[PDB]
Design a protein around this ligand. Structure first.
Ligand code: GDP
Ligand code: MG
Length: 166
């Protein structure tokens, strides 16, 4: 049975754990320790292939743990998440994408740009800033809400599709 090794990256606070917990447990968690970094496993059928996702929900960025360095080096695809009401999280995407590029000595790494918290009012990052950035990197952009679950499956399934394509 095929396994897809996925890494969820992005600023503290943007919804990486909430998105992961939606996928795994189908509920929205309001507070999940922002310091917990761990891996989760989910068996799913995507385009008629029963597969296993092995997902690292990252937490303590730049404080090097041997589990993160390994998923960094061995991860096959990356969800790069910012929050649409957090300008700074969106500006930070560059740094994450740069860390991914450096570790893979490649600009062709399976990646999806995720704009989360779509359910929130008066976003500060316009859809157009997100589309232009994903167009520049050559990757899909998917808007999500961990709260309502909109886009959550589509983000992870599209990443799996990007791994296949690569
Ligand atoms: N309204 C709303 N809140 C969210 C969403 N995703 C996460 N959150 C909230 O934002 C906070 C940060 O989420 P969390 O998953 O801890 O962020 P992480 O540091 O990126 O793991 C938590 O209070 C979550 O309830 C979302 O899609 N919509
Ligand atoms: Mg977290």
């Amino acid at each position: 049975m095929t396994e897809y090794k996925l890494v969820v990256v992005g600023a503290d606070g943007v919804g990486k754990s909430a998105l992961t917990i939606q996928l795994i447990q189908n509920h929205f968690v309001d507070e999940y320790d922002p310091t917990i970094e761990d891996s989760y496993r989910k068996q799913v059928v995507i385009d008629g292939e029963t597969c296993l996702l092995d997902i690292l929900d990252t937490a303590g960025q730049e404080e090097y743990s041997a589990m993160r360095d390994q998923y960094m080096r061995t991860g096959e695809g990356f969800l790069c998440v910012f929050a649409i009401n957090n300008t700074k999280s969106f500006e930070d995407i560059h740094h994450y994408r740069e860390q991914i590029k450096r570790v893979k000595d490649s600009e062709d790494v399976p990646m999806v740009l995720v704009g989360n918290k779509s359910d929130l009012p008066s976003r500060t990052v316009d859809t157009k800033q997100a589309q232009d950035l994903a167009r520049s990197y050559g990757i899909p952009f998917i808007e999500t809400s961990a709260k309502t679950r909109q886009g959550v499956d589509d983000a992870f399934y599209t990443l799996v599709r990007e791994i296949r394509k690569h």
